[PDB]
Scaffold this motif. Structure first.
Motif, PDB file in Angstrom:
ATOM      1  N   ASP F 120       0.905  -1.195  -0.151  1.00  0.00           N
ATOM      2  CA  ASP F 120       0.061  -0.010   0.086  1.00  0.00           C
ATOM      3  C   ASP F 120       0.853   1.253   0.096  1.00  0.00           C
ATOM      4  OD1 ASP F 120      -1.989   1.659  -0.018  1.00  0.00           O
ATOM      5  OD2 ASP F 120      -2.759   1.045   2.097  1.00  0.00           O
ATOM      6  N   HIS F 124       0.945   4.113  -2.941  1.00  0.00           N
ATOM      7  CA  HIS F 124       0.625   5.412  -2.708  1.00  0.00           C
ATOM      8  C   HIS F 124       1.730   6.446  -3.085  1.00  0.00           C
ATOM      9  CE1 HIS F 124      -0.289   8.993  -0.563  1.00  0.00           C
ATOM     10  NE2 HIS F 124       0.483   8.771   0.621  1.00  0.00           N
ATOM     11  N   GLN F 129      -4.243   7.202  -6.301  1.00  0.00           N
ATOM     12  CA  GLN F 129      -5.562   8.208  -6.530  1.00  0.00           C
ATOM     13  C   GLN F 129      -6.734   6.997  -7.179  1.00  0.00           C
ATOM     14  OE1 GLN F 129      -4.500  11.727  -8.040  1.00  0.00           O
ATOM     15  NE2 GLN F 129      -3.383  12.296  -6.400  1.00  0.00           N
ATOM     16  N   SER F 130      -6.819   6.164  -6.502  1.00  0.00           N
ATOM     17  CA  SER F 130      -8.018   5.193  -6.833  1.00  0.00           C
ATOM     18  C   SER F 130      -8.929   4.676  -5.878  1.00  0.00           C
ATOM     19  CB  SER F 130      -7.143   3.984  -7.706  1.00  0.00           C
ATOM     20  OG  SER F 130      -8.512   3.027  -8.517  1.00  0.00           O
ATOM     21  N   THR F 131     -10.073   5.091  -6.313  1.00  0.00           N
ATOM     22  CA  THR F 131     -11.174   4.614  -5.099  1.00  0.00           C
ATOM     23  C   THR F 131     -12.222   3.684  -6.060  1.00  0.00           C
ATOM     24  OG1 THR F 131     -12.319   6.685  -5.592  1.00  0.00           O
ATOM     25  CG2 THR F 131     -11.094   6.287  -3.675  1.00  0.00           C
ATOM     26  N   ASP F 132     -12.012   2.307  -6.394  1.00  0.00           N
ATOM     27  CA  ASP F 132     -12.709   1.458  -7.161  1.00  0.00           C
ATOM     28  C   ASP F 132     -12.284   0.067  -6.778  1.00  0.00           C
ATOM     29  OD1 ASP F 132     -13.123   1.799 -10.818  1.00  0.00           O
ATOM     30  OD2 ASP F 132     -14.331   0.700  -9.309  1.00  0.00           O
ATOM     31  N   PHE F 133     -12.609  -0.905  -7.579  1.00  0.00           N
ATOM     32  CA  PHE F 133     -12.205  -2.312  -7.391  1.00  0.00           C
ATOM     33  C   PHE F 133     -10.693  -2.432  -7.794  1.00  0.00           C
ATOM     34  CE2 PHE F 133     -12.917  -6.579  -6.564  1.00  0.00           C
ATOM     35  CZ  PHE F 133     -11.964  -7.205  -7.151  1.00  0.00           C
ATOM     36  N   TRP F 135      -8.545  -0.663  -6.758  1.00  0.00           N
ATOM     37  CA  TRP F 135      -7.566  -0.595  -5.415  1.00  0.00           C
ATOM     38  C   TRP F 135      -6.998  -2.008  -5.046  1.00  0.00           C
ATOM     39  CZ3 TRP F 135      -6.993  -2.513  -0.744  1.00  0.00           C
ATOM     40  CH2 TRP F 135      -6.282  -1.581   0.074  1.00  0.00           C
ATOM     41  N   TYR F 136      -7.715  -3.011  -5.430  1.00  0.00           N
ATOM     42  CA  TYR F 136      -7.235  -4.450  -4.931  1.00  0.00           C
ATOM     43  C   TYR F 136      -6.556  -5.123  -6.117  1.00  0.00           C
ATOM     44  CZ  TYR F 136     -10.660  -4.149  -1.287  1.00  0.00           C
ATOM     45  OH  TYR F 136     -11.521  -3.694  -0.249  1.00  0.00           O
TER      46      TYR F 136
ATOM     47  N   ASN H  54     -15.993  11.036  -2.536  1.00  0.00           N
ATOM     48  CA  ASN H  54     -15.001  10.551  -3.252  1.00  0.00           C
ATOM     49  C   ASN H  54     -13.520  11.344  -3.226  1.00  0.00           C
ATOM     50  OD1 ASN H  54     -13.433   9.021  -5.212  1.00  0.00           O
ATOM     51  ND2 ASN H  54     -14.038  10.192  -7.116  1.00  0.00           N
ATOM     52  N   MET H  57     -12.574  10.456   0.259  1.00  0.00           N
ATOM     53  CA  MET H  57     -11.861   9.140   0.461  1.00  0.00           C
ATOM     54  C   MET H  57     -10.426   9.251  -0.073  1.00  0.00           C
ATOM     55  N   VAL H  58     -10.527   9.822  -1.268  1.00  0.00           N
ATOM     56  CA  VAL H  58      -8.896   9.795  -1.847  1.00  0.00           C
ATOM     57  C   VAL H  58      -7.985  10.512  -0.932  1.00  0.00           C
ATOM     58  CG1 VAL H  58      -7.490  10.973  -3.577  1.00  0.00           C
ATOM     59  CG2 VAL H  58      -9.523   9.737  -4.331  1.00  0.00           C
ATOM     60  N   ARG H  61      -6.487   8.452   2.471  1.00  0.00           N
ATOM     61  CA  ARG H  61      -6.176   7.219   1.921  1.00  0.00           C
ATOM     62  C   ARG H  61      -6.751   6.045   2.729  1.00  0.00           C
ATOM     63  NH1 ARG H  61      -1.432   6.269   4.299  1.00  0.00           N
ATOM     64  NH2 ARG H  61      -0.656   4.930   2.807  1.00  0.00           N
ATOM     65  N   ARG H  63      -9.689   2.827   2.328  1.00  0.00           N
ATOM     66  CA  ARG H  63      -9.693   1.389   1.635  1.00  0.00           C
ATOM     67  C   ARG H  63     -10.943   1.262   1.087  1.00  0.00           C
ATOM     68  NH1 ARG H  63     -11.159  -4.144   2.172  1.00  0.00           N
ATOM     69  NH2 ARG H  63     -11.906  -4.104   4.106  1.00  0.00           N
ATOM     70  N   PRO H  64     -11.426   1.251  -0.255  1.00  0.00           N
ATOM     71  CA  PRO H  64     -12.846   1.253  -0.573  1.00  0.00           C
ATOM     72  C   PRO H  64     -13.261  -0.286  -0.284  1.00  0.00           C
ATOM     73  CG  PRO H  64     -11.446   0.963  -2.581  1.00  0.00           C
ATOM     74  CD  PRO H  64     -10.439   1.307  -1.191  1.00  0.00           C
ATOM     75  N   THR H  65     -14.765  -0.448  -0.156  1.00  0.00           N
ATOM     76  CA  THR H  65     -15.145  -1.845   0.342  1.00  0.00           C
ATOM     77  C   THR H  65     -14.773  -2.739  -1.012  1.00  0.00           C
ATOM     78  OG1 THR H  65     -17.259  -3.176   0.855  1.00  0.00           O
ATOM     79  CG2 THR H  65     -17.472  -1.463  -0.671  1.00  0.00           C
ATOM     80  N   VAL H  66     -14.893  -4.264  -0.720  1.00  0.00           N
ATOM     81  CA  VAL H  66     -14.761  -5.053  -1.692  1.00  0.00           C
ATOM     82  C   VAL H  66     -16.012  -5.509  -2.603  1.00  0.00           C
ATOM     83  CG1 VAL H  66     -14.961  -7.057  -0.442  1.00  0.00           C
ATOM     84  CG2 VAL H  66     -13.142  -6.852  -2.450  1.00  0.00           C
ATOM     85  N   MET H  68     -17.874  -3.598  -3.702  1.00  0.00           N
ATOM     86  CA  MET H  68     -18.549  -2.525  -4.973  1.00  0.00           C
ATOM     87  C   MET H  68     -19.094  -3.007  -6.224  1.00  0.00           C
ATOM     88  SD  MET H  68     -16.452   1.226  -4.696  1.00  0.00           S
ATOM     89  CE  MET H  68     -17.488   1.739  -6.017  1.00  0.00           C
ATOM     90  N   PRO H  69     -18.344  -4.393  -6.902  1.00  0.00           N
ATOM     91  CA  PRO H  69     -18.939  -4.785  -7.867  1.00  0.00           C
ATOM     92  C   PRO H  69     -20.121  -5.539  -7.845  1.00  0.00           C
ATOM     93  CG  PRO H  69     -16.478  -5.260  -7.978  1.00  0.00           C
ATOM     94  CD  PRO H  69     -16.884  -4.650  -6.626  1.00  0.00           C
ATOM     95  N   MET H 113     -19.858  12.962  18.027  1.00  0.00           N
ATOM     96  CA  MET H 113     -19.839  14.022  19.230  1.00  0.00           C
ATOM     97  C   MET H 113     -19.760  13.511  20.557  1.00  0.00           C
ATOM     98  SD  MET H 113     -22.603  17.103  18.793  1.00  0.00           S
ATOM     99  CE  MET H 113     -23.783  15.991  19.242  1.00  0.00           C
TER     100      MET H 113
END
Lengths: 165, 179, 165, 165, 179, 179, 179, 165
Positions: F120, F124, F129-133, F135-136, H54, H57-58, H61, H63-66, H68-69, H113
């Motif tokens: 990671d 980085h 700069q990727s927020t998608d699949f 990322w894996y 988005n 989230m960038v 840093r 981690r996007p959920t797995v 998503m597809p 809070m």
């Protein structure tokens, strides 16, 4: 009936892929040593088996199992997991996987001669020859007799999942 | 594969005839052909299960004639376990090795299926007509009573294993009191 | 905050139950031999620990894990599974389970001194004493190491699953 | 071949138990009203079916499904979940479950006349009569047509899970 | 957030004060504030659970003195369920609506947690002291006895709901005989 | 407490100096105080990961100032993997033993987390700069390129491991062509 | 039975001739029998799938002679999807009802199996010999291109549905560039 | 403590992606009609929210959920599943998903809070504004009140899984 022979080819393809991958791992770790040349012959045998079953799978328009990207990291982790323990973690993995393959070849050649033994033998002789060539060198320490069993149990569960999914 | 396996059956049946001084290894299998080794143990277990079934059946077809008395479930289950365990008396010295072989992590499905079929054929003759969740509990509640008892017979030294039978009592009573 | 002091008691009760059951099995197989008294002493220590955590659980009105009827057939199968492979096959099970218990006692006493170190010590001294008594005799073969790890990696999923459920 | 004549009896027993429980719930909620008698008649029909399949399961020495203690709280929750929404719980849940039962009776009577149609009819006539009696009164709002489907899908997944496991 | 919740609580209470002719809608909430709507029902259930706990505690603190005889377990459970159910007497008109709202497929977790906490606080003051699998069975074996009984009270018409209480007897006895 | 672990850290840091003497066994860890072993390896790996992060950061703080050329993603990844692997040069003799220790079935979670964090950071500091699949995939598509390459360095005998670096080329190019 | 299934099939294949006048109801099938849950949509979809297979086969038997040119993969896929979609032209009035009925939560397995078989028989005649994970992606990568396109044809009004076909281009080219 | 401020950004990203897909489907089905503009405005609002989360989230840093597809075929099915039942998919699905989003925004703004209310408000004001803009138009048939619940339960289970996995 077509969905009955539509399962044996998929499972055989998956099993031969897993075995090829395991031998690739063990050859990557124990490459330049005095035992490397022993694993090369088995790797070539398994590549040949895989090519044969691959053309046979392309012919009958079979569906490859969906888990194939998972036996690619678990078929190589048991090629550096074992084979780093010396030439006792290598002799105990190949024997186990080949005994599992031979057992399933027997189990398949059983339920295909008692259900319809005449609509075939363009494929059954292949299974018989493969079983013979797989068991010829499977014959060639009370703690390793448990590692072999715990590897055989995994190689027998991974075949039951690759049938359906 | 019909005229060859029917002879492998005879090979195994004649091989397991003399194992008081040779062990369950892969040599008494071939030494018996003159006249790990999991297949031999599984064959012996299957054969003893079938013989227990047949004995229970010959006993069942004896009360419709009014010749044999009737017993409660306690006495019947005790006698069933006793006459099933009394088959392991000749092969008593080399048994723990076979028990180890039967418990390896790749022989558990087969052995567990055999144990379940034995427990079922043992409960069915003791008038059990139940279609509930009780179909499972009772079965399980007996499997233990068998397994544990076995683990005593291999380490008992009392005359004619009398001690072991006493244990069975103190293990089925506490069981038939909703245990 | 009560869930934090609840999960720890629940998982400790579950782990001590599993250990007591394992030792019961190993004593049932190796009973009348030259290795009886060691297993007997360990079994007595674990029964004492279980009684202590049982009264501590009854006090705080906490919820026992739902899987307890499953560690009763899997805590006795590893008491005839091992201990039939000889002495050195039984020694490699107690060491593994006790190292797992000690590791979790350490991990559990860590997150209880850095979050609130003054609302306690009616329970923390108990954890410390138990860790000491559990690690005092965990100290007392290239394959018998692997067989240990595959046992030390099962008592770490049975703790991950037994505190949540 | 006995597994084929075993699975069908197990599925039928489980499904009739579930239907009996659903009607018991709906009768417990809408008991003393103007709809009671219909639910009572259907409940009596289902108790009759259950007794028949129960004696048939006792005869052939079959294994009842292990999930039966789960259809006992999920077969009664759809007897207060619906039937509290008025008289449109006693006209969508019953219709859905009876259509599912009839569909599976058809699916069973299909694969039992094309595989062996002469070693039977001591059981097949029973299935046919039950299908007729189940579909006779199953025939007797764009949003309810979705509740019915989302109930039928569950009553199909339940039959599947109860037949395999 | 302090004043927000401190006013929401009083709003919900004053609203709940009079729902004999307005139903558990979003209408009586404002009619109470002057002086689906599932939050009101959940608040009512939580408050009645808390008051049941408090009443059981006040009753228990009269046993350490010596002024109240120690009844058996079944009698205490019958009395606890009767005490908890006698709070639904004024609101018995529009209860089925709230029971329907409480069973929608997205309110089941909250309602089930409340029911579990109630059953736990009802069993604990009866001297359970159980750390086994019996922690679950008993709990479940009581939840039914509650739910079913409720589904009778809403459709009974006998004086003093007497019939309902009789049912409780014929539902707890069959339970205290291991049912 | 605090001083206990704060000094055990120094114990391990001083013990891992003369590892080419004994090895990763439990002999050098205790003997280091004079100046299995499944914690020394994890400490060494964590320290080298932190130093790789720091080196990448000190290098990135130069390109955002001038006087530092830029280069494509494949070249940067090759240089990063080479930099991280050139730390295992003095300990290269006794490495396969530590690699065996790191792959036992009860140390896989920790080692896998360390590998994931290393990959990671390595990605980085290359402008992902990727927020998608994606990322894996990319992460995985690099972990292999690392692990495999390691399994060559332990069995190479070429001068200054030159051969190994060539392999890296023929393993990253195929990756940057959507491999 | 043979006659029962034959008469069912005849009723279904003769019923959907007057669907452009009544709709996918039970009324149209009863009217057709002269000479709710439909099953008619499923019969129609199966029949059109079979005819598409047969047409692709008749076309393939013309390129192994020398009369038809072998065009690229993307063009063949566009032509296959256009050919399969040009069967829904006379039934375009009452189609959204059938598409709704096909998507109820209890008809998804059957419809999904039919869609998968159609996509497979459409890819196999395109020259796809793949035994890998790519067996899945490609299939999925086409199902979308079909479904989405359908959801345009039902709401388009351009002559000859020209607009729709243009969409197909901008949906398959964007897919053939590793979509 | 970074996991706490991480497991909220991940959930918010996943939920906004799901909502965007739902509106994309409903716009694909009901495009050229008299209801198009409302769904178009909601889709633009959700695209704005997604772009904001988005970039957020960038920055951290995350981690996007797995999974998503998987919300990409299940976020478009409920845009043709509903919205084909007339103008009751555009008034029973949007309301449900927006009420679920608002409920989770409240649940997040609660536990942020009371644990640390001063190391933030570069992010908390964003959550508050988003909750207001999400609930402003969520307020704008006894059977259409169960479809809403069975959609909200799914949209809650899908948030239970995005964070942990």
């Amino acid at each position: 009936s077509r969905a009955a022979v539509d399962r044996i080819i998929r499972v055989d393809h998956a099993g031969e892929y897993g075995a090829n991958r395991i031998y690739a791992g063990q050859m990557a770790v124990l490459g330049r040593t005095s035992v490397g040349p022993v694993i090369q012959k088995m790797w070539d045998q398994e590549k040949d088996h895989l090519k044969k079953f691959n053309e046979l799978m392309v012919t009958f328009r079979v569906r490859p199992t969906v888990l194939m990207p998972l036996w690619n990291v678990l078929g190589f982790a048991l090629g550096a997991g074992t084979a780093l323990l010396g030439k006792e973690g290598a002799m105990a993995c190949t024997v186990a996987v080949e005994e599992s393959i031979a057992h399933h070849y027997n189990n398949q050649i059983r339920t295909l001669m008692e259900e319809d033994p005449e609509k075939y033998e363009e494929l059954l002789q292949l299974i018989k020859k493969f079983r013979d060539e797989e068991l010829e060198h499977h014959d060639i320490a009370p703690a390793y007799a448990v590692l072999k069993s715990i590897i055989q149990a995994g190689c027998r569960v991974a075949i039951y999942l690759s049938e359906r999914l | 594969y019909e005229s060859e396996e029917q002879l492998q059956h005879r090979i195994l049946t004649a091989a397991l005839e003399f194992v008081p001084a040779h062990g369950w290894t892969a040599e008494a299998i071939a030494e018996g052909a003159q006249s790990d080794g999991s297949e031999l143990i599984l064959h012996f277990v299957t054969q003893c299960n079938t013989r227990l079934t047949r004995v229970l059946e010959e006993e069942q077809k004896l009360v419709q004639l009014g010749q044999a008395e009737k017993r409660k479930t306690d006495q019947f289950l005790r006698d069933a376990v006793e006459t099933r365990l009394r088959m392991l008396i000749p092969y008593i010295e080399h048994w723990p090795r076979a028990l180890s072989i039967l418990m390896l992590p790749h022989n558990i499905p087969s052995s567990l299926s055999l144990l379940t079929s034995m427990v079922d054929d043992m409960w069915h003759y003791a008038g059990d007509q139940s279609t509930d969740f009780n179909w499972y509990t009772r079965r399980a509640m007996l499997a233990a009573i068998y397994n544990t008892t076995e683990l005593v017979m291999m380490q008992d030294s009392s005359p004619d294993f009398e001690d072991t039978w006493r244990f069975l009592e103190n293990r089925v009573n506490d069981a038939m009191n909703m245990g």
